[PDB]
Amino acid sequence: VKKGFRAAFRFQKELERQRLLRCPPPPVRRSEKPNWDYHAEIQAFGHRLQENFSLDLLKTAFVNSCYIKSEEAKRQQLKSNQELSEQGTSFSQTCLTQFLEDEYPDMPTEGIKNLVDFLTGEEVVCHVARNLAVEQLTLSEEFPVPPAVLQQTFFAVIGALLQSSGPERTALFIRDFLITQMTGKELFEMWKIINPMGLLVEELKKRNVSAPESRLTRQSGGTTALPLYFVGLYCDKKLIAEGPGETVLVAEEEAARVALRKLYGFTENRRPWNY
Amino acid sequence: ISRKWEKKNKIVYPPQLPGEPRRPAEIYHCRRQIKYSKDKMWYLAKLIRGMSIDQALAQLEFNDKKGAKIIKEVLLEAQDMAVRDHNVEFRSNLYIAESTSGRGQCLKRIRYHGRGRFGIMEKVYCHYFVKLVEGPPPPPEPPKTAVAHAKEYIQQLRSRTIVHTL
């Protein structure tokens, strides 16, 4: 028994750290932990993003309905969220179609509607709000916050900033957080499609161009388990695209995808977003 | 001495919901201070690690080693406490999920060698640990075919990147 206190204390804390990393505690929300001031942290949310709100209206922007229901059920023993989220999702859809219809005029409206269904989808919006400290400020029932609730609070913050500082500062807000989520992403990783060849044929009929010949340009390893093909797509003996594939069908459909990117201005080499 | 394996039949779970699959039972039984060595018990413990308990009883009634009778005592005792104490309805519906064997507290005796020199014999003791799980035994892992190896090689070829550049 070695006399002392300090090695027993440090080893007591490392036994505490191994008890944590063995049985990790369930995630408790941030409001139920020390060093929390909800008003100072709403104000910090305002100054953090570099805009001004009307702070009581942002307080209503973070309050859900399921929290109001469970709060009334805890009263047995506040304005809801729906309006600001409705204004924010209407305005956010209209600004995303304005930005996309302006910066991609050759796109079809189906593809722009699916791009806004990507940029306002739950994966993107729930990825943005968990890194803008929205999830910590949402007053909700269950924890961790379900995705449709957190999407509803995110567009509640957008509609709240619409009522705070008008349409144009919210247009810059959506410009700087929702649009920058499509940087580096493929068109057909956002607007996922099936059978690009038939869609490419209809797009050539809308430009009144004759139907394309799918036409093998270069190949390698045709009789092995690792082939490589470059199928081109010619249109009156002039190619629109050419793509590789492990088989011939894969290279043909993927050359149809490259042709669809070049028809829409959504190439890999397009002029980037201007900020 | 630590005796943490007797405690594992005491962990009580909260009652389930209607929207939840039925949990298989788990039955922890062990014998302490078996006079046998810990790595002669590894072969008999290893033999039965995925078999059902009726198959394992069949394999241990007919093995010549000393530990087979003792493991059959442990498995019969864990089948009885399986039915009585642990709410396992079918006796046959049990497979050995874990059968290990640690070392016990041994003894030290003197073995006399050919001169004044000698050696220190150990009287070797061991334990024997068992977790039975209610249910059919899991299927043995099928050996991966040329389809699985071909997809693994091609998935590695698809995985690779131009390295040490942008």
């Binding site: 057909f188 390893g221 690792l226 793509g243 | 698809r158 690779r160």
Partner: protein, 59 residues
């Protein structure tokens, strides 16, 4: 350009069968070219751990 991820990646690293006639040729000067095209040292995507060699048929 403007491919997807996996077809671009398949296109960059796919290996090319070469043919190489060796009539009246010295075997070491064929062995230099065959060696370079077997290691992938004729590709600027060359790395020793990327497995980017090719096939060489010498007739």
């Amino acid at each position: 350009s403007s491919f997807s991820r996996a077809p671009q990646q398949w296109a960059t690293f796919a290996r090319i069968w070469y043919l190489l006639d060796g009539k009246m040729q010295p075997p070491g000067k064929l062995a230099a070219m065959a060696s370079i095209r077997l290691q992938g040292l004729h590709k600027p995507v060359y790395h020793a751990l990327s497995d980017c060699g090719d096939h060489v048929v010498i007739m």
